């Protein structure tokens, strides 16, 4: 019953609420407000889907709690599978086994996909206790419900016959399956430029699933792989698909990372870099230069800014009702009004915390529907950030 993907904060959103003409809606796909920002998100999503342009970046600015990451997650969901979406934070680049610049340029590798189609022949069959052990060509009783083929094979194939014997181009591999044994299966695999790492050394897929690999071989395995995958393109071998790289709280990047991104977005296979920041006028990390959003101007000019206005009472209560639908909480209109007030006063995330605590208290007191007294007792029990700040007068081990 209980799955890994339990109910989360950004779980209610399951898409972007836009029309055919990218026209936002009042309430759809878990999206309530941010009409202009939602339309911008849809525009950039359609641009990414086009894939004809490369080396573009976008920044989602706005105050904390104004749907900054919600719009990004909605764009990711609307993008759907089959397109890489590397979601990371500004603190991930700070790795030890690899340099921050190398970590970033590898994250870029995780944002560009490539589809490859393989046409192979796979034979049917069933295990009937073939290839007995100790106790020549041998015997192979290949048979299917539709048609049977009782024939033998060489010595290097009788020892690999064994419930469903799915012989393929490899040295064999494992009710009787139906249909002709000879069947053409066209399988398509999508990798995020894994060739740079999957061909780094011997037994290197081990590294691809371990990250133990140190800084890749600069300008020796990344450019050759790019040239080879380009040769594949235009020849019917493979085609590359651009993904998205989402760096939440990008202000943690340093001047080095910004200077590297300045030119990383100027390549043929440069993915669309969407970013988000809550800080305003703040010193760029590693220096004392104060710039907006903590990002230098030479990079902010290379991207498009997307502002997210704050939510109102209507949008606040609508998002609260959407979260209720996501969860299993139910309350009365008076409770809705009280929660909307508390949220518009303090914050929306704190309001969601309070409504969760109120549903829990209701479940504890055997109640069926949360009421005003429940949320009041909750607010009394769980204090707010600003509320606790007022009580800081106690001087609890100051600096």
């Amino acid at each position: 019953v209980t799955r890994i993907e339990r109910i989360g904060a950004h779980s209610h959103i399951r898409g972007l609420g836009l029309d055919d003409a990218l026209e936002p809606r009042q309430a759809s796909q878990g999206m309530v407000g941010q009409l202009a920002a939602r339309r911008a998100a849809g525009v950039v999503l359609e641009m990414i889907r086009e894939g004809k342009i490369a080396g573009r970046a976008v920044l989602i600015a706005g105050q904390p709690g104004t749907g900054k990451t919600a719009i990004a997650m909605g764009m990711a969901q609307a993008l759907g599978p089959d397109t890489p979406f590397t979601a990371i934070a500004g603190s991930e680049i700070f790795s030890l086994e690899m340099s921050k610049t190398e970590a970033l340029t590898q994250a870029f590798r995780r944002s560009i996909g490539v589809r490859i189609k393989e046409e192979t022949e796979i034979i049917e069959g069933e295990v009937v206790e073939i290839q007995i052990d100790r106790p020549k060509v041998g015997k192979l009783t290949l048979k299917t419900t539709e048609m049977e083929t009782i024939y033998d094979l060489g010595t290097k194939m009788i020892e690999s016959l064994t419930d469903v014997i799915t012989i393929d181009k490899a040295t064999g591999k494992i009710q009787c399956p139906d249909g002709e044994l000879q069947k053409r299966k066209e399988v398509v695999h999508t990798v995020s430029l894994h060739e740079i790492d999957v061909i780094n050394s011997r037994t290197q897929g081990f590294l691809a699933l371990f990250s133990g690999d140190t800084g890749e071989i600069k300008s020796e395995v990344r450019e050759q792989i790019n040239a080879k995958v380009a040769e594949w393109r235009e020849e019917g071998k493979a085609e590359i698909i651009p993904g998205v790289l989402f760096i939440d709280e990008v202000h943690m990047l340093d001047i080095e990372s910004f200077s590297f991104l300045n030119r990383a977005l100027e390549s043929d296979m440069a993915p669309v870099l969407i970013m988000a920041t809550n800080r305003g006028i703040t010193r760029i990390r590693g220096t004392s230069y104060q710039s907006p959003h903590g990002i230098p101007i030479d990079l902010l000019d290379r991207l498009l800014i997307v502002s997210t206005t704050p939510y109102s009472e209507k949008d606040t209560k609508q998002i609260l009702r959407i979260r209720c639908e996501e969860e299993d909480v139910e309350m009365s209109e008076d409770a809705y009004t009280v929660l909307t007030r508390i949220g518009l006063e303090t914050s929306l995330r704190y309001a969601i915390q309070l409504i969760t605590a109120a549903s829990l208290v209701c479940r504890k007191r055997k109640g069926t529907e949360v009421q005003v007294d429940d949320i009041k007792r909750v607010y009394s029990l769980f204090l707010d950030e600003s509320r606790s700040t007022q009580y800081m007068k106690e001087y609890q081990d100051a600096f």
Binding site: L22, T203, S219, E256, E266, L300, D301, L304
Partner: protein
Amino acid sequence: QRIASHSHVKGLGLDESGLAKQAASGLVGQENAREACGVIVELIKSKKMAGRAVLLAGPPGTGKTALALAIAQELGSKVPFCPMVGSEVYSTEIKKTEVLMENFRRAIGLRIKETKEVYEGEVTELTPCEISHVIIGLKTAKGTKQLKLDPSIFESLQKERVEAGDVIYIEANSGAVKRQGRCDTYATEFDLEAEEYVPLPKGDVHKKKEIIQDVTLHDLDVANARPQGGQDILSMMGQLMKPKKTEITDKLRGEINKVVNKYIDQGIAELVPGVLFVDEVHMLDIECFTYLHRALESSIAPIVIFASNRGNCVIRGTEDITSPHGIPLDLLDRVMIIRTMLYTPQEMKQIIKIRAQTEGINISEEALNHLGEIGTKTTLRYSVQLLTPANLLAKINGKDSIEKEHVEEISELFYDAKSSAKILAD
């Protein structure tokens, strides 16, 4: 083609007399910097000088990187061109000086001229005699013969699991590989063996062709930085640090240079010095600038192009010393500085039109005027970025070209650095 930020730049745009045209080869205006670029590109093509430096200094968004890419295109793929960034020097497993030296070495290339021939032959004719002398048969689609080989080739062959009816390639000097099947493996109707087959090869039994492989000194260094494999020294597992910490110059790089000079004197190899384009030079530390102004003085250092976006500021790693272009006066001197000037509104509109033509976007007259106005308002890059979503919305709304309404709407939707800072005061 996945148009990039510098795709329309397919050249530098110099005429036969050397002067820079007003607008050609994707570039617009900037005649002085283009002339300097066309002079330094000839300097590079001369292949006589070494370690000469260049600095494409100028305000942001002036096309210094565009000029660097134009130089790279004009030079052609026959000479190496290493695009480099300052942040890349901050490696975790290699010291900054060593990364810089490796980039310098990569910026030097040499072409290896060689005429290799093959001795493809049939395995079914394998008939050794004495382990001291062996004979193999030849059967191609154009002829059939036989060859005589040294027993060492027979050993290297039997090392592989050769089988009757396989296609094996035997090089005249060394090496051997197997290709299974010659239109006989699928005939017996035996199932696959984890490998794909191939029909018999066409052409003569003995082939010879001229070979030219473009290899750089860094490849030689990396190859010589390992035991080359072979015996038990071939031990190689995951996490292997192919880009090793460092490699001494006197006893390893010196030997590489000596052998390259020998093979060049013998006429087998031909050197082709490349270019090292280091972008965001101001990001390098002072301990990097001090070694850079000395390494480029060596007789083997190639041409290095620099580009400092920001102006005078504190040098990295010092926190007290301030120099123009964020580069110390020591390295600033001896580096030819090419100043890049700002673009005029007409030049901005022309660049916007060229970008629209290259990317396939079609803009109207009033639309182009409005886009150029929005560009000169804040910066040209903002208009270049808005150009695409304008046509995207036009297509969404059913319009083939961009109009004033679409450009105005997309400008109001998104925001630029100036507009963002204006509203950020809240």
